[PDB]
Design a protein around this ligand. Structure first.
Ligand SMILES: Nc1ncnc2c1ncn2[C@@H]1O[C@H](COP(=O)(O)OP(=O)(O)O)[C@@H](O)[C@H]1O
Ligand SMILES: Nc1ncnc2c1ncn2[C@@H]1O[C@H](COP(=O)(O)OP(=O)(O)O)[C@@H](O)[C@H]1O
Ligand SMILES: [Mg+2]
Ligand SMILES: [Mg+2]
Lengths: 82, 160, 375, 133, 74, 375, 82
């Protein structure tokens, strides 16, 4: 019975240490979750703004093409009327 | 501001019990006499409940601006306020709406950079590297030179 | 601005409603005229789901709506939806109450009377405007060109009409109204796309076919040569990315869709193309103003924006017309909004300020006032 | 780049903005007092019979009724503005703010704080059942 | 919308506040007191209406910023 | 809390019953749904031996019981046992009489009507609740993610169903319900463990095999490479201690058990895996909402907790889908209770407060009220 | 002695649970570390490419302005020619 009491108290201090380790892990978990949420939100915004920029670039490119071609044709016609 | 109101509201049934328990548990003395002026960190370690890090950082920094290294009973109440979630919770959104209206008293449809410039001129705060940098980052959130309402709306959100 | 009172130049159109205050260069708000009720059931509670999305809002939620245009061919077939469109236009796209602004609607030539009378009755009873005036869609397009003569071919999206005008005197016996327009071209393109495997059926996918037509189609200078070239080489096949991927390749469907304008036999219509109804409209005019009409042929309306139409039409008319006359086709770059620019100019005139149909006049003669002197 | 300086500048800007808002509120109170002062009618009560008193009362009541009508019209206009603002707010909500429900709830009450009690009670029940024999 | 019902409601509310008095239901001093009471009520109403006008100005601010944001969506 | 009245958000499920009051973060009581009668004779007198241990009590005395689940595949096959489970849930795990609390059950899509009608009849006659409402298990999981669009794959333990939703409008013609789920994976794992010598047969040992599956199995990113690696090295063999000793070593059975999800031909099922029924469910939707569904693919349910599934599924769909669309898979850490969290959110809404099936309504129309407007 | 032994068994099971907590915490934390790093890298790249597109779009604006002016010139020449 004496030996068993010894083992009981040893396991008792071990259990307290275990609980503390558990709480520390819990706090770390909450922290990392917060960080991940923030960074993912930033990812959303970054992707969306990239898309906006790409679309606008496309539209401006097309308009440039059209107007340039019209100008070239009218230049040819100016020479013709000369 | 809300800090004084929080210090006054420290006196309650729950936070008083927390303060009494902390005093009875890990405020006794009988140390080696090192003068542990940094016992606020020891209280944080013995708290068992870690609050938002902003509260702890502000408690460490903003108090004893004179470097006293000594804490009064009123400072005990302030620390216990920092323990629980006694924050104003980002103030009132009505305050943010009224601030945005006062900024748009000229009816510009958004907070122009002139508004922040004149407010900074009135307050006289030293123009550091973060000065103007923050204004350009928030106003040009789209980085296109246009300042939208949502930019400073969410910028002023989440703080008191 | 300030005191005083500005006029609202609305322009119902059929496909795009264009509106804005009188005296500017471009319409303030341009948005499709579609009203689409949701068709599925809806399970989320409290999402704030409305019963009808109108205007440009229903071009973003079109995946779960059934869009339906309230104007078929110039005429208005669904008056409740048209009233909803007008209410949206006044209150949300311009944010000006109609109680303090004159309005200047536009109407195609040769339209049913009841349509015009109902339009004025709505504007005077529901929205309660101070005074409204209805103008023919071609005279405005002639205003915008800064001319005073000329024969204008206003090929909109609903109906194509061809009003000749000389020295400010319109010729009512020479108006040739044809009901082929952009919508029929969209349907024909959607029908010939099926020859490659792409099937668009839903009323929402008609918008996708319309976008394909706008961005890719062009009018061929000579039809047979293009048909022969597209059948041998592959220099014409232009690709386009659907709203979900799966790019498509349009071959000789590019110039076959807008060719229907010059050969309405493609969609089974009997009448002659827009290249020959203009010549017929000219030949009905008197013998002494045909040279001026030949020299001042004006193009307007959205559908006349196809790349290469101002040359095909000139070639066709030069083939038809006598060899001595000079054929010139005025194609301003601001073709789409030409009618609205002309409307703004007309509403900004001082001489026109006493032609409005004042409300007291309507109260004394009823809605039939529009056919009277105040035209 | 300087987090400490960023926080200091944000706090100072917030405080000075609050002071300016309070100054604006005081200005608004002064303007309201001026409006109340200038809205009074200069009237005389010397040498007027009770018939004139009743006539003045009816005129003042008519003006009060007109002011009430104007106030009700402005209240209706502001109510319409409030309705359209709420419509825009729900538009923003469905565009972006759809995550309000997982925010409006109660968490960390007993499940996150009282969890070992179940195991303790189970062990005590097992011990009691063993001791029943 | 539906201005007839709005007009009817406004007229009904005004008729509720139709504070018409009789001949021998008050006194001359009492009539002056009633006039001053109506004056004070009108002044409180004017203060409330000025606050309402400021709130409507802020509503206009919100309207323009919200329409700007919605247009910025596209 | 105090006055007022809170709702009971029960969630029958199949394998774990999750319940709790509306407005919290996690279910109050989670316990397996098994009812096990004793099977041996019993010689001790006065031991207080009951006739049926339900819930978590029968997971501790499972050595001498014959556990049998009352819910096979979503549907309920043994109504007396299900009534017993509900009675236990209300009275012993929550200790709140049902006479004073609304209830919000959950039901899989495409289930037999009689199951739902019997469920409501029981709740109204036996337990005598004030009002109950039945909701589809996928809409709740979409609530919990805070979205309003997206296609949710709710791979529970009974049945895997895939409900696409856009802008709050569910698409009833695109629901793809497949009956492979966690239970079939447990049976297949128990069947392939026999290749090393370990034989589990008793209905009690199915729980041990379930624990092995939960703690050890994982989904391979690429199946053939893992099969080749596990056949050469020995870096995968993880050992596990049975409830009595005699540790076992699981080799390439680790990633072969959950691979059945993506190749249902392993257990003889014809249909395609969960990686291809999602793509098919998307392709049945309209052409204009496919991008949003691609970008907002949501995972839920217990069985989607395997380590490494959110990458395998994304790789598979990216292989199937067009190259331009972005494929994103939402896998919240609180996957298991996602349906119940969504149920709590829905029950806490003010707009939803008038959708309950009030008892007087049931008295007037009978149990068939559930199929009516109050869905 | 028997009571002490029972206590010991209880402590043993609790220690087991604690180690279980430790392992699961570590696993989840490593997972979130992986996600954090991947998200951060992708966010960086997306911001970079979006800014690139913005620069190209501004260049396109300037090109379009040049072309518009030249078209105005050619149009004036053609009309005078007429
Ligand atoms: N850039 C373009 N190229 C080809 N077709 C176009 C273009 N823009 C518009 N359209 C066609 O013209 C129609 C719009 O015509 P519009 O002038 O708005 O009609 P309305 O007279 O009713 O205003 C659209 O339906 C479209 O089919
Ligand atoms: N951590 C886990 N890893 C792998 N599989 C799990 C895990 N947790 C639960 N499961 C499987 O999921 C099932 C529980 O699913 P659940 O979502 O409770 O079903 P229901 O929809 O009926 O509630 C269990 O039978 C188990 O097989
Ligand atoms: Mg037109
Ligand atoms: Mg489930």
């Amino acid at each position: 019975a004496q030996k068993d009491e010894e083992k009981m108290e040893i396991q008792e201090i071990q259990l307290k240490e275990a609980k503390h380790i558990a709480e520390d892990a819990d706090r770390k978990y909450e922290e990392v979750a917060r960080k991940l949420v923030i960074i993912e939100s930033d990812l959303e915004r970054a992707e969306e703004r990239a898309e906006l920029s790409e679309g606008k670039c496309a539209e401006l490119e097309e308009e440039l093409k059209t107007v340039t071609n019209n100008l070239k044709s009218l230049e040819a016609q100016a020479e013709k009327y000369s | 501001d809300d800090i004084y109101k929080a210090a006054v509201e420290q006196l309650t049934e729950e936070q008083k019990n927390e303060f009494k328990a902390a005093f009875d548990i890990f405020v006794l003395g009988a140390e080696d006499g090192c003068i542990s002026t940094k016992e606020l960190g020891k209280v944080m370690r013995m708290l068992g409940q870690n609050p938002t890090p902003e509260e702890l950082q502000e408690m460490i920094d903003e108090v004893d601006e004179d470097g006293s290294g000594t804490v009064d009973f009123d400072e005990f109440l302030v620390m216990m306020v920092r323990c629980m979630k006694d924050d104003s919770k980002g103030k009132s959104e009505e305050e943010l709406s009224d601030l945005f209206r006062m900024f748009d008293k000229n009816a510009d449809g958004y907070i122009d950079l002139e508004e922040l410039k004149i407010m900074l001129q009135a307050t006289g705060e030293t123009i550091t590297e973060d000065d103007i940098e923050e204004l350009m980052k928030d106003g040009d959130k789209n980085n296109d030179g246009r300042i939208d309402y949502d930019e400073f709306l969410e910028f002023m959100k989440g703080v008191e | 601005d300030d005191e005083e009172t500005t006029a609202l130049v609305c322009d119902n159109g059929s496909g795009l409603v264009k509106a804005g205050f009188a005296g500017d260069d471009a319409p303030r708000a341009v948005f499709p005229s579609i009203v689409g009720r949701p068709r599925h059931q809806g399970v989320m509670v409290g999402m704030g789901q409305k019963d009808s999305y109108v205007g440009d809002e229903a071009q973003s939620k079109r995946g779960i709506l059934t869009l339906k245009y309230p104007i078929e061919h110039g005429i208005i077939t669904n008056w409740d939806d048209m009233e909803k469109i007008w209410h949206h236009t006044f209150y949300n796209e311009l944010r000006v109450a109609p109680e303090e602004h004159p309005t200047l609607l536009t109407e195609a030539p040769l339209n049913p009377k009841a349509n015009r009378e109902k339009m004025t009755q709505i504007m005077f009873e529901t929205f309660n405007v101070p005074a409204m005036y209805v103008a023919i869609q071609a005279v405005l397009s002639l205003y915008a060109s800064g001319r005073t003569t000329g024969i204008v071919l206003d090929s909109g999206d609903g109906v194509t009409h061809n009003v000749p005008i000389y020295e400010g005197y319109a010729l009512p016996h020479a108006i040739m109204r044809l009901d082929l327009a952009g919508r029929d071209l969209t349907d024909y393109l959607m029908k010939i796309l099926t020859e490659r495997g792409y099937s668009f059926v839903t009323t929402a996918e008609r918008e996708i076919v319309r976008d394909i037509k706008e961005k890719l189609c062009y009018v061929a200078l000579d039809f047979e040569n293009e048909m022969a070239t597209a059948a041998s080489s592959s220099s014409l096949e232009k690709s386009y990315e659907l709203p979900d991927g799966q790019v498509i390749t349009i071959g000789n469907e590019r110039f076959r869709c807008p060719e229907t304008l010059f050969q309405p036999s493609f969609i089974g219509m009997e009448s002659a193309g827009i290249h020959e109804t203009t010549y017929n409209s000219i030949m009905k005019c008197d013998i002494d103003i045909r040279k001026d009409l030949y020299a001042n042929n004006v193009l307007s309306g959205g559908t006349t924006m196809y790349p290469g139409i101002a040359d095909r039409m000139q070639k066709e008319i030069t083939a038809l017309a006598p060899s001595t006359m000079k054929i010139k086709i005025i194609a301003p770059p601001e073709r789409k909004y030409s009618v609205w620019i002309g409307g703004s100019i007309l509403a900004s005139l001082s001489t026109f300020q006493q032609m409005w149909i004042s409300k007291q006049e309507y109260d004394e003669a009823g809605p039939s006032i529009v056919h009277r002197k105040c035209f | 780049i300087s987090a400490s300086r960023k926080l200091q500048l944000k706090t100072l800007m917030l405080q000075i903005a609050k002071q300016e808002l309070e100054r604006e509120a005081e200005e608004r109170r002064g303007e309201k007092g001026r409006a109340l002062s200038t809205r009074c009618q200069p009237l005389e009560l010397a040498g007027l019979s009770f018939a004139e008193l009743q006539d003045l009362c009816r005129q003042l009541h008519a003006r009060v009724d007109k002011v009430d009508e104007e106030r009700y019209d402005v209240e209706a206009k502001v109510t319409k503005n409030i309705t359209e603002i709420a419509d825009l707010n729900q538009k923003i909500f469905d565009l972006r703010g759809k995550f309000k429900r997982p925010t409006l709830r109660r968490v960390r009450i007993s499940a996150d704080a009282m969890m070992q009690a179940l195991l303790g009670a189970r062990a005590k029940e097992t011990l009691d059942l063993r001791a029943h024999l | 919308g539906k201005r007839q019902t709005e007009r009817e409601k406004k007229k009904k509310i005004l008729a509720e506040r139709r504070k018409v008095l009789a001949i021998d239901h008050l006194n001359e001093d009492q009539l002056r007191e009633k006039a001053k009471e109506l004056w004070q009520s009108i002044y409180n109403l004017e203060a409330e209406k000025f606050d309402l006008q400021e709130k409507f100005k802020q509503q206009k601010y919100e309207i323009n910023v919200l329409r700007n944001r919605i247009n910025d969506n596209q």
